[model samples]
Target: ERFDAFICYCPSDIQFVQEMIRQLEQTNYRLKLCVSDRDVLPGTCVWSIASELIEKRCRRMVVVVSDDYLQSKECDFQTKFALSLSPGAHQKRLIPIKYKAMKKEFPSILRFITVCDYTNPCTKSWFWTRLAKALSLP
Candidate 1:
């Protein structure tokens, strides 16, 4: 897949979403950004369709978990679905990105998969390295 074809999975943190997209696009990376309002259907139940699309159509799923993500219906549904679909729900298919100082622990389903600490993601070459190795992106 083209580097531009990567999809960004996130919570309803539009500010963080926008900033992260900006920073990533500025890099040598050419990601195809998919925001809910722009890419998904316009409705309160957009998550159902988005989940199906990400699972069946998109190449990868990046689950951005913050203090508020689990509270969002969209994120919850998608994350749960991804967990159920993974092989024993243990794979890089659904990558978690922790963005805030969360009070609650990550969802039980996600405890098995490693998460990227985006708070200090600056030196996290291992994140992209692992992602590229999993997706075989260049």
Candidate 2:
């Protein structure tokens, strides 16, 4: 494994993804993240490359779920791949982070896992702490 977590996001949520990058890589936590767009090599298949990263290169999967995210079939595949590692989410293998309020219902498969919901202001302070802790395995 080369990273603390593999990040799942789309062009629409890229701004939020960058913010999360700063939060993880710049802080004392200094957690390394494997983001799809940046990690994939040129002239290569994004699907297979990403499949490898989420499956083996990272310790966990951090999905930045949004309305835009729900629309993509590739993202759907990525999330499903993460869940396969820990079916029923019995282990903390896949983490869904909600940054925007969605017009669509929350993805049912991800509903079974806990979310680091940014929409909730009350818990905003410890957001990174919770996410950072999630990346760590005993």
Candidate 3:
């Protein structure tokens, strides 16, 4: 696959998204991200690309679980669709993370899988390394 991750984030968090790309895409991790603002092709419906990215192109959907994350309709679609992609024989098609702290509670379903805490200072040292290994082909 061309990308290791499909980051579903709100427009407000574009800087963080770029930071993730720099660390993962440009680092020793050498991982890639299909970011909507940067890679979404023109002409065709964007959802088509989002769905394709979730189901086929990328190994996982790394959703930025910020406050605005829940508000975006596109983010909702990708997250819901990714979860549906694996019903029983579940591989974590969707990966959620708190790119920063949220004042509100996240979706209940997000609690099932371990959520990455990128915003946590003490544990921040190895965050990228863990995520890089996580998205690798197994």
Measured by lDDT, the strongest candidate is: 2
lDDT of 2 by residue, 22-122 (tens): 89878888888887777666886767866777777887889999999999888888898888888998878899999898899989998778899988989
lDDT (10s digit) by residue, model 1, range 110-138? 78787766666574656555543444432
TM-score of 2: 0.93
Off by over 4 Å in 3: none
Give the residue spans of candidate 2 off by over 4 A.
none
| Candidate achieving the largest TM-score | 2
Against the true structure, candidate 1 reaches a TM-score of 0.72
> Which lDDT tens digits does candidate 3 get at residues 105-128?
987657787677888998888788
List TM-scores for all candidates, in order: 0.72, 0.93, 0.91
User: Cα lDDT for residue 137, model 2?
Assistant: 74
Clashing pairs in 3: none
- What's the CA RMSD for each of the models? 3.8, 1.3, 1.7
What is the Cα-based lDDT of residue 52 in candidate 2?
74
Of 1 and 3, the candidate ahead on TM-score is: 3
